[PDB]
Every structure is written in structure tokens, then in C-alpha cells.
Symmetry: D2
Subunit: 433 residues, 4 copies
């Protein structure tokens, strides 16, 4: 399928960003086997085609802020003049309560560094979930907060504010009515996201009472006042939280969210999803359910280039890792695990050779099958994966294919071996004419 | 004590060494879930009492030799004038064949460094399993090899050798008879260990045709000639290999070996064991089978001093880890996991308080019970383990015991929680009067 | 001004344009070298041709597990937002030169060895690769000293299909030198492949030493080549010169190196750049070393975070980096300074200033913000606090003695009472 | 001049400790070119003979305490049952004031870990310069403080305390009279050191007003009360501080201190010194001035074992460094720099060959001369140092000596090259028969 878009790790709280005709999504990371929020670092993924997502690994950690105690929660990255500002909530060590920090990088992949050495903003309590938006006039605005929605106008430097922290009036006209809660007069729960289309500003937000849904408000200007719009997406699935990120890419609008749809998924082991966001003619948004996502890619993938093992459309029983020597790589966790890429254009001439960086800890009996169409589709080639000792050691295997491959294909790599776990590790692949 | 003596890791190829009235055993490390030999680094454990073993973690890695390809196999550390020489077999990258290197350190725990930058010795083939022995006259001897037993006279510097590589005559007189195996004329397989008692030198060795047993030879000189002695220990258990280390400690002789007796144990997931070695009055060794090991501690453990969580007699469902912040620590893998230490002397006054450095990733419901005698014995105290976020973050918990503890006790630490895995992590403990 | 980088010894410049920013990858001569001591590669970037951002080390010889050392002249090329860095290193396997290739997903890396072995290794002289992707999408690699070699690379950019071609070392193609049968032509090493209109150019260091820069032209990227002439004679304190040529925003630039920094030499070099002029027929007249770009092609915005290591001209400053703050600069002695050119404060102007700074000295350490030159009027003084070492930092906010308006050159002068290591400086910004 | 004992780095605040018949000194480290106290990490050096000192490198840093802001000041390590407790003063980040922490390790070289994650003790102000002493009955005592001398009884576990922080009565019968300062009523300034000899306890301490001298007090009990003894050593030389460490080794007592006697030395670039401490028959101490140290080694150095380049008696124009590959090594900063080792026993047969691990960044012209007696003494051999590229690359050079060397010698290694700086680097050496 196409949702969740990442299956190699538990991801949540998606925050998209476009730079130079590429779509990135920054995410939080739920540790495996969590029964509570175990969130320590932030990830970024990217796509050129909306069906294949490249895993770029960790780009920031809570410990990159020397004053942070933990809790790497929902963040957002925005770009301006080739610099990338990543706004993050963390619990501070100084007073043991939430705060918003900011790191800055010169690429979407970083490296990102704490430029303040202290919080950008810390209130009385409830300093989580920042969203930042740069308007057409160049003015930058930040909203955040749980339980209270707060607002500040950011300076041009993007790393300070002047003025006060504005507590947005929690009105039933602005955010709807919840009943039976005085800490929470409205449906607003947390996680604001500020977006613009035509002449209208949108504030998307998780709403309560739990399990969370996604609601929205509208306004004529970025600073409010806000107008309740309705429910964008009702509560659904195994994750009691949902968290929105909305963005335009190549003339369409996309709605990122998360759920608990992976094996072992839950409210503490979530997974990021995406589907198209459709507007009515007046600019309102119809209620939508969780769908299977993007069914058709908007561009082809070139198989005659180095393509990462961690550029994945759909997979099962594969996890992602990284190290300093090769970067991000994937490991097959059991026999018959697979990765797939969609909309691969082998062209008219066709591919006759194939190369891959691979390895295994097992002595014999490890293969990777290149198949077309599905995990049981026709076999184009089989790679014998050599013993390397561990994922710090790798070999490149070049094979001639049983038959030249042409045209548009979906390519499946199936990993086979005699062991019960850790069948092999896979870094990148390529085809040759 | 009980066997295996290490249950928090798969360990093999034990190599004991005495320094300053403490007994150390250096071991290889079988990675979890191995179906082939996956061995990357070397460990050292130590004891003061023969029943409680301290895990000192990794003290050397194959990659600490820049010319090594992998295969961190059976090693031995010897001491001379406060310097420690660890002889290791590794496969070389230069020629893709085995070689013997040597690292030197200034404590039993290192740090250890490759002092040559190249092999100490490399022959034509089968350069594995070194043993090194310093005679009463101060002369050092090295044996090694599979299939051919090889010998060199080491120089005083211990990191070079004099003369030629001697191939020891593989005669039935020296090592017994194996049935038509052109390549293996004798029972000798690999893994020599040179030991001295009274006026007699012993060479212990794994023998084939396999499953492996332990045989021995004797001589009047450390260079030989060697005369076949008999079977020290027949093949037994789930490991097709066995590997001996013999040494005197406080007037008794101990026989270290390995088997496959841990859960998930096998020939590639082995576990180190020890039992006493008894001699006949003429110096020969009566054959023995694998026993429970050490029944009685030769010294008490002081509970009023800092004692490591990784100082363990017997345990279940505990694994050991390390990092640079706290060193070695242990993790409980499921509810009802436990560690135990034997022969703890609380004295006549007794313990009234307890302290422990611990943490968990779970939110509530995590306790560690201190019990006496067994994992089901009387509860002396309970520790509430707080949420810290991950094993990079820790708290110290101080509790007053309801029951004062006196006299000699066996202390069990039982780890309890509501989650199905990774209950908590544990670094050290101590009692107060 | 030239050299364009003064905070380290840099050499073998290899420019590259990505998304309207101009990068230059360089090699790194260690301080106090009496021989080639070259271990890692750097990348700098500009928006304006007068201020250069130091992005730090982006690759090391040791990132190739098979390399013994000698991180020499490299080039990075981009294709569909992936970046391929072709590097010469000495291999441990046979103790001779080889070309490797690393790949990254931004100009700043991270870059990883994707082969685990050389991309190419011949019998001898495997140094100084240049790579060019033609209009038809096909990529060409040249390299070599003493023999110019060529292969055509596949699209994957990390392999080649045909044979290693030894380009004929003829006078019609590379000029004539007499003596040295092993060097029949002026060609010495360091080829650079560039295209302008209908003509391909191969620039190269020429001998005998001290090196000059010559060029050849061709109608195809694969040759055959025809000698053009001398682009730049030998001059100054570096017996090597190494060319990189590129178009940026409608002009052509010639990167090279010399030994013009204090302590400079043939083993402590410094990268330079000046505009490259062509004749109407596409030939190149001889040019000498100039003072470089006299005017910036864009303004610098002082109201955004600006790195201390974004520098036009400086004295007695060195660059460093760590994982906590990234790249930063240290003032090595009193009267060290950095400067940035063509800064647009606008009509209203700046009233406040912030810098991340620190020092190891107890009192007496200041950084002066001055306009126009290092002796120009003082807009503000920053008292730099004791932090203990460049692992610890403080942000200092000041109000300016007067508002700053219009286009300015900004000088940051570092002062203290000690003999060395006055302070360290990470970034700054102004506020309205 | 055998003082200072360490010339390859600026060292201060010596704290000796004996373990298994070897003498260690833990020191603070003054960064080069300091005009203020720039102190970040702790060092340990060791000797077998009182004339040659081995550099063991950094064994702990301020940053190994996650709560420390900086100022790695005067520390002391004590041993008990093969565990080593290192008490350090650092400034806490929580409140920006001084605190005492404690790290624990399992060898004198570490690794050492903060076992509390917080201060062992923090008072209102003055938390520097701890000394710890374990008495004959096994109870441990801690003194510290500036300006106020403070005391606590440590628990058996050595990482906690009993009762209250005791402010020792700052009396003139106990610590003499100053006059002029209300916060300094007595000569006591800081830096206490608790020592025992026969039935008398001694507390040594820096005294003021500055420049600091060393005075002492006596008692019959470790906890006091204290009786002023007199001045042990008046202020002298270029360091306005002095800091005492006193200890017995092989039947003599040694007084460690520091001064500013190296090139570039000062109050912020200090150097550790040692000389013998003499007592009168009644246990009082005659006043002494700075001497040039130990004139004769109490044991010979064996040149036929691996000997570190950083085992040095006297040197000029040499600095010490370290990395993970080789450990500690030395660099000659200019032509004619040298190291020296004293009392080296080549024996009756003698050395005929020499080996050394070395390298240089220069292309040709680099030699290392082995000389006897002095840096201009007879040349036994010359080693051509090869180009390696940097101190991350090394070669071993073996040479035949021009003449055999026999008997007791002082060995000088002189580093020569044509360059103006950084001639070469040197890791270890050894002779062969
Ligand atoms: Ca968000
Ligand atoms: Ca990869
Ligand atoms: Ca062995
Ligand atoms: Ca521990
Ligand atoms: Ca080049
Ligand atoms: Ca910076
Ligand atoms: Ca002291
Ligand atoms: Ca050394």
C-alpha cells in the first residue's frame, strides 16, 4: 500500500517542508517496544515522486541541546534564504519543564546546531508542539502549546522574538466546544499547524477529548482571529494521538498525519501517513477518513543511478539503521522480508546488469531476489550475499540478469536466508544497461 | 558460582590470569543469534571469591588492529612487571589469512593497544589460538595453531620472537591417535594451553575428530618433547567446540572451558564455565565430566561497598551492556528476571538502608525487590524505579529497609514491571549501616 | 581580495554551482608543513563573490578504509541533487595512487565511500581527477601525472565501461617542453574540463616547475585536444598552481592557488579567484594574478544569523570546528580581525547586535564592531566573558552606540591583554 | 635538577597514591598559554624508581560529570580493595558554585565514572580541594574547603556521608595567625591533605596571605582537634600557589608540591615537583626549601622491555599527546629536543639492537640519536625516522647499535631535523640483546 509511508521505524508528528523541488518530512521517532513516550531524536525523509520515500536518518537529537533532559517531541523545520530553522520542544534540565529550542542548519539534512544554548521560549507550563510560518510579507509567526495555545511574532533572525507571549483566547467560536473540562474549554488539544491557501489562513490542530481527531480553524490574517472550520479527520485506528502537517507540492496539497497501523503499532509506536487534501470551492475542507494514500507517482525513479536501500515505497519485516561508514542502511529481520520501489523507468533500451552493497552474518544460504510487480512476481535476478561478519563490513555484488528489463516497473527486493532473525543488510543498489 | 559462570552474554575460549590476588578470565564474545562464528571483541571478567564474577566489558576489539579483517578468536593475556600482553588471533586484511597480533596495556582492564601495527607472527596457514607462558627462568614460550601445532621462543620484550617457527612433530606418542585423517594424524585439534605444576609442564588442547573433547600432554621442558596424557574432559553438551584454560589461584587449580548451556546456547552461542582441576599424586589428571562448578565461595562479598549490577553469581533473563557514561550495566529482559550474588557478609550490626542506580523506559509499575536466599525468598526491601527515558539517563534510589539484615546471605535482585520486555536497567548497588 | 580564504591553508580549488550558490571544494595543507601534509577536504561557499562561508571538513582520507593518506586535488559534481566527489588517495593495498568516489545528498555531505575500493587504479600517476557531465547527459573523467588519462563513466557516476585511454602526449595538443622524455609536452598534471558555447576547454598545470596554467581546446569533451596557450604564468611563493573554472550568474571565474598568506609556501598554499576573460573567438589571453573580485554581486543581510566563518578578509584568525557549534574562528593574537563586505543595513538601520563568543582569559577581552576598516569608527564593543574553552560559549547582546545604515563593510576586531588565543567567535546578527 | 618531575605539560595539585608497589600521582592540568586557571581534565603519572615518570594521559575530565560547568581543580584518589575513588572539585551547572564529586574506577588508570550524577557534597560556599584518608580501623574521613576548612565522616561505601558538614574551628592554636582578613583568621588558605605517620595525624595545607606557603597541623585523631605545627615550606619561585601531597613509598616519605619552573611557567602554567620529607624524632617537621629532587633512583629501569617514550626523567622542548590508536606519545617541538631516562641497567651481556615506534611529517632529514650520559654524550646509534604523514600514522624502526651497551646508563633520545617545528613523534622503544 502507500500508508504508512515509513515502515522501517516508528515515526510520528510529521512536519513537511519543500526545498528546491524536493519534499521533505521531519518526524519524531518512537523507540521500538515503547509502552510510554520514548522519543529521543528527530528524523527527516524525502521524496521526488510521492510514492518512494528516502530515509535520511537522524538529523538532530535531544542531547544536541546541552540543556535538554529528554522528550524530543513534535518539531518543524522552515527554510529562509538557504538556511533551515528547526524548532523543537524538549524538557529543560534547568527547571524540569517543557521549552522550545531552535537549531539551524545549512542543508535540509543539517548538520543542525543549537544556536542559543538555552530555550527560544519557555512559558509557565505547556511549551510543546511549535509551528512556524513565514508570510508573503516576510514576517514569521510561531504558534504552540498544550493545553493553552500561545503565539509570538518572530524577529527576522528567526531565533528570537520581541513583544510578549500572547495567549490566544480559547473561544468556542475559534475552536469549537468540548464538554466537561475546565482546563480545556474548546476542542483544541495541542499541535497547531499554520498554513495558507489563496487568501485564507488555516490552523490545523489535534482535538480532544481523546482519542484525538484533527480539526481546523480559518482566519484572514496569520495572527487571527480564528474561526472554527470543523473536523478534518475523525479519530480512527490504534493511535490515540494524531498530528497534522499540511503543505503544497507541485500544485497539490498534502495532509501528513500518523496512526498505529504498523505491526506492533500503538499510541506509543506510531507511523507517519500522507494523503491528498481536497478543498471545497469556498475554501472549506470536507471531513475525510484515512485512505491508502497516493496511488500514482508524480515522477519516475531512475534505476540507472545509485538508489538507496532506504528509499522505500512499501516493505515488510525490514528495519532501518545507520552508521558513520555507509550512512543509512536496512536490515531484513526474517526470511521473505522485502522492500519495494514504485514507478521505476527502465526505459526502452533496458537493464542487463545489477549492482548492490550488501552483507550478512550467516555462512551460506543468503540470497536477495530482484522481482517485478509484487513480492511473488517474476524473478529478474538473484544476488548471493557474502558473509561479511557484521554491518560494519560490506561487499558489492555485480550480477548479470536473466533477462533485460524495460519500461515502467515496480521493483521488489526479497531477502532470503536460513536464520530466524537478521537475514542480511542492504545499503544501495543500481542497474546498468 | 554454578555453571555457566557468565549468563549475561555468550562467551567462549576462556583465558585466565592472576594479578595482585584477583583472578581474571579473558574471553571471546559470540554475538547474539549467531548461526556462524560472529566474534568481534574480547571481554574480561574477574573474581575475588570464585562464585561472584564482575563483568568488565569490552577491553579490545578486532578493529583496534588497523590491519585486521575480523574474526576475534581465542586470545590469552599474560602479565610481567605490571604490563599486560594480550595475544590475539585475527584474520589479516593484507592477505585474507589468519595471523597472531599482540596488544599491550598497563592494567588488566587496559587500555590495550596494538604495539606492532602488523602481525606478531604469520605463517602459511592456521594461525589461531595462541598460548603464552613465562617460565621460572623468565623465558617466554608461545604455542598456537590449527591444524599444525607451532611454537616460538619469545624475546624478553614479549612482542617479538627469536629464531624460526617450529612445527611440533604431530606424533601419536605426543598427542594420541586419530583414525585415518590425512590432515590430522593425532587427537590434537587446536587451542593449546601451556601450564606448569611442580616439576611438570602440561599442554592442554581441544581434540578431535569432533565433537571436541579436551586432552593433555606432559613434558619436562616447556619446549617439549610432549607425551600424551589422556582425556581431561570428554565431549558433552550443545557446543561442538571446547576450549581450555588452566590456572592456580590461592592454592587450588581451576579448569575453565565453555559449553552451550544458556538458553539459546549452541556452538556459536557458547558460555564459559569453570570447575576445580584435581591431580593424581603422580601428576596425571583423572578424566572428569562437566559439573555444577564451585559449590562454596572462598571469600565473602562486602555489601557495604559499591557493588556492580554486573557482579553476578547466577541470573535469568538479564543481558549486559555498556556505555561511556556509566560503564557496564545490566538490563532485565522480562518480568521476573533476576540477578544474585552469593556469600554476602552483612556482619553483626547489619544493614538498614539500600542504594541503587537504576532506570526504566516505562511509566509506573516498575520495582526491584531485594530478597534473601532465593528469587522467592523473604523481601528485605523494594525500590521504585523511576522513568528516566533510556539507559543513557539514571537516578540513584535510596530506601530504608524494613528488615535489618545480618550474617551471611545470598542476595537476589528481582526486576518487576507491567511491560513485556526491557523492564529496567541497573548499574550498581550498596547497603548502609 | 585574494587569497579568498585566510583562516587555513587551502589548495587545489574545485568550484561547483548548486541552486544559485557557488561552492569551492579545496584540499587542506596542514599548518607548518615542509612537505605535502594533506589529510582532509573542505568546502566553502558564496552568494556574492566577496564573502566566503567556511563549511568545515566534509571528507577525510580515512573515510576510505583502503586509503593510506595524501588527500590531494578533488572535484565534486552534482546530478539530480546527488553529489559525487572524486578524490585521489594513496591506497594501502599497493601503496600507490588511486581515484575514489564518495556520494552525498547535499553539497555539505555527509559523503560516503560507495565502492570500498578505487573507482580506478592504473600503473602509475593516479592523481588529480576532473569530471564533466556533457549536454547529452554523458560524463567524462580525466586525470593523471605524468600521463593524462581518460575514461568515460556510466550514468551511475561510480563506474566506467570502456578502457583506460592514455591521451596522446603531443605538442599540437599540449605544447612543447624540451628535456624530460617522460614529459614531452607542457602538461604536468591537474586537468580541468569546462565548456563554453561551442568549445570545450581542458585547463592544466604545466611545467617545468614552477607551474603555470595552460589550456587546450576541443570540439568534443573526449578530444582530440589542441593547444591553446598560457592562461597564467608562474608567480609568487607556490611552485604549484591548480585551476578550477566555472560559470556563475553570467560570468566565468578562474580559481587557482598561491602562497600569499603569512607563512605561505608551496606546502602552505591559499586559494584565490579572479574573473576569466575570453577573446571573441574563444581563446584566452594570458593574465597575471590580480587582487580578485573588487565588487560583490549581491548584498549580505546583517539581520539574519551570519557565521563568524563567513569572511571576506581577515588577519591572525584561524578556523576550527566541533560537533556542538559547528565551525567557529579563533583570534590568535591582538589585532586579529575578520571583515565582511557589501553589507546592506538599509534606511532605518541596526540598533542592537548579538554574538556567540567566549574566551579562556579572565577579563580584558573585547570585540570591536567597526565600519569600513579595522581602524574605522566603533559602532559597539562586546565584552567577551570567560567561558573556560571553546567547548563553552555565551551570547552577548549589545545596543550600538549609533544606528548603522546603508551599505557597509563590517570589521570585527579582537582585543585582549594576552599573548595568544584571544577569543573564539561562532556567529553574529544585528537587530533593527 | 630533578624537579619539576614532569616537563611535557603543565601539571599542578599533586595527589600521590600507592597501589601494588607502584607510586602514582594524580594531577590537575594547566592548559598551555594560560593567563588564568584553565583546567579541564585530570592526569595520572607513575613511577617504579622515583626518577623516571610514566605519563598515563587523561584519566578523567570535568565533562564526565554531566552536572559540571568546569574548573577541574585539585583532586585526590584513594584505593580500597582494588577499587579507586577519585574525589574532585568542580563548579556545578545547577547553581554555578563549587561542589565535590566522586568518580570510581577498577584500576588506577580508570576508566573512572561519576557514580552519583550529582555532588557528593555541596555547602553554602567554598567547595574545593578535597582530601580523603582511610584510617587503620577502616573508617574514612574527608576534609576540604576555601576559605573555611570543613570535615565529614564518610560512609564505608566512600560515596556518601553520615552526619553533618562540620566547620572546623578556625583557631590560631590549630592553624596560626594571619591578621588583616576576617574571613581568614588563621594561616590556613585551602588545599588540606590528611596523612598519618606512626601515632600522629598530619594535616598539610597551603597558607596565606599569598604568595602561598605550606604549613601543617598535628593531632592524635583524624577528626581533630588540630595543633599548629609550623611552616613546612615557605613561598618560593614563580607560582603564587603551592599545593601539598604527602605519602610513604618503600620506607621513605615524599612531599609532592608544584611551582612555576618550566619554560613559560607561571601561577597558571605550573609544574609538579617532589622531594623527600624528613621528620624529627618527635614527629615534627623541619622547615625546608625547594630542592632539586631525588638524586638517586631506588630501582633500575629494564631497557629490554617495551618502555614508553612518555616515561621520562628529564626532557627539553618535548610535549605529550594522546590518541586512541597508540595511547600517549611525545612530540619534539624543535631540533635538538630530547628526553632522558635514568638508572637504566643494560647488564653484563648488553644491548646490540634498538627498536622504536616513531614518525614524522617531514620528507627526509629526521634522525633520533641514542646517547649516553647527556644530550652531547657518546652516540650509541642513530635512527632514521620515516615520513608517515601525521601522528595518526606510525612505523617501527629496528637498528643495530654501533657499539654494545652494558651496565648502568642514563639514556638520552635526541630528536634532530631541518625544520623549524614539530620534528617528529615517538611512542615507545626497546633494546634487544
Ligand atoms: Ca507540529
Ligand atoms: Ca544507504
Ligand atoms: Ca587459548
Ligand atoms: Ca555498573
Ligand atoms: Ca583538480
Ligand atoms: Ca559558526
Ligand atoms: Ca590536594
Ligand atoms: Ca606511548
Amino acid at each position: 500500500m502507500q500508508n504508512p509511508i515509513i515502515q522501517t521505524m516508528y515515526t510520528a508528528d510529521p512536519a513537511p517542508m519543500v526545498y528546491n523541488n524536493r519534499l521533505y518530512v521531519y518526524t519524531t521517532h518512537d523507540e521500538d517496544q515503547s509502552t510510554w513516550f520514548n522519543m529521543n531524536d528527530w528524523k527527516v525523509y524525502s521524496t521526488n515522486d510521492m510514492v518512494n520515500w528516502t530515509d535520511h536518518g537522524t538529523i538532530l537529537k535531544y542531547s544536541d541541546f546541552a540543556w535538554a533532559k529528554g522528550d524530543a517531541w513534535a518539531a518543524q523545520c522552515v527554510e529562509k534564504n538557504g538556511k533551515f530553522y528547526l524548532y523543537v520542544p524538549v524538557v529543560s534540565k534547568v527547571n524540569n519543564k517543557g521549552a522550545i529550542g531552535v537549531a539551524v542548519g545549512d542543508s535540509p539534512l543539517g548538520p543542525f546546531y543549537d544556536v542559543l544554548g538555552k530555550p527560544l521560549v519557555q512559558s509557565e507550563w505547556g511549551d510543546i508542539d511549535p509551528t512556524v510560518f513565514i508570510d508573503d510579507d516576510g514576517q514569521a509567526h510561531m504558534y504552540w502549546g498544550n493545553p493553552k495555545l500561545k503565539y509570538v511574532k518572530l524577529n527576522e533572525d528567526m531565533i528570537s522574538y520581541s513583544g510578549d507571549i500572547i495567549e490566544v483566547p480559547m473561544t468556542e467560536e475559534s475552536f469549537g466546544k468540548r464538554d466537561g473540562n475546565p482546563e480545556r474549554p474548546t476542542k483544541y488539544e495541542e499541535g497547531p499547524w499554520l498554513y495558507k491557501r489563496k487568501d485564507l489562513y488555516y490552523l490545523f490542530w489535534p482535538g480532544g477529548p481523546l482519542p484525538e481527531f484533527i480539526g481546523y480553524s480559518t482566519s484572514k490574517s496569520a495572527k487571527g482571529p480564528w474561526k472554527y472550520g470543523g473536523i478534518v479527520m475523525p479519530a480512527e485506528g490504534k493511535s490515540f494521538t494524531n498530528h497534522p502537517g499540511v503543505i503544497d507540492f507541485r500544485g497539490k496539497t498534502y495532509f501528513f498525519y500518523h496512526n498505529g497501523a504498523l505491526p506492533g503499532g500503538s499510541g506509543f509506536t506510531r507511523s507517519v501517513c500522507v494523503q491528498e487534501l481536497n478543498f471545497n470551492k469556498d475554501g472549506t475542507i470536507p471531513q475525510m477518513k484515512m485512505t491508502e494514500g497516493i496511488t500514482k507517482g508524480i515522477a519516475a525513479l531512475n534505476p540507472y543511478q545509485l538508489t538507496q536501500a532506504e528509499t522505500i515505497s512499501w516493505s515488510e519485516h525490514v528495519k532501518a539503521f545507520q552508521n558513520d561508514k555507509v550512512g543509512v542502511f536496512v536490515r531484513a529481520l526474517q526470511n521473505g522480508a522485502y522492500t519495494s520501489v514504485k514507478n521505476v523507468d527502465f526505459g526502452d533500451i533496458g537493464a542487463s546488469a545489477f549492482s548492490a552493497r550488501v552483507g550478512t552474518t550467516h555462512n551460506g544460504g543468503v540470497t536477495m531476489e530482484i522481482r517485478m510487480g509484487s513480492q511473488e512476481g517474476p524473478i529478474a535476478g538473484t544476488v548471493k550475499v557474502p558473509l561479511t561478519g557484521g554491518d560494519d563490513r560490506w561487499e558489492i555484488i555485480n550480477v548479470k540478469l536473466d533477462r533485460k528489463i524495460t519500461g515502467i516497473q515496480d521493483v521488489y527486493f526479497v531477502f532470503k536466508g536460513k536464520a530466524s532473525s537478521n537475514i542480511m543488510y542492504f545499503d544501495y543498489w543500481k542497474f546498468s544497461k
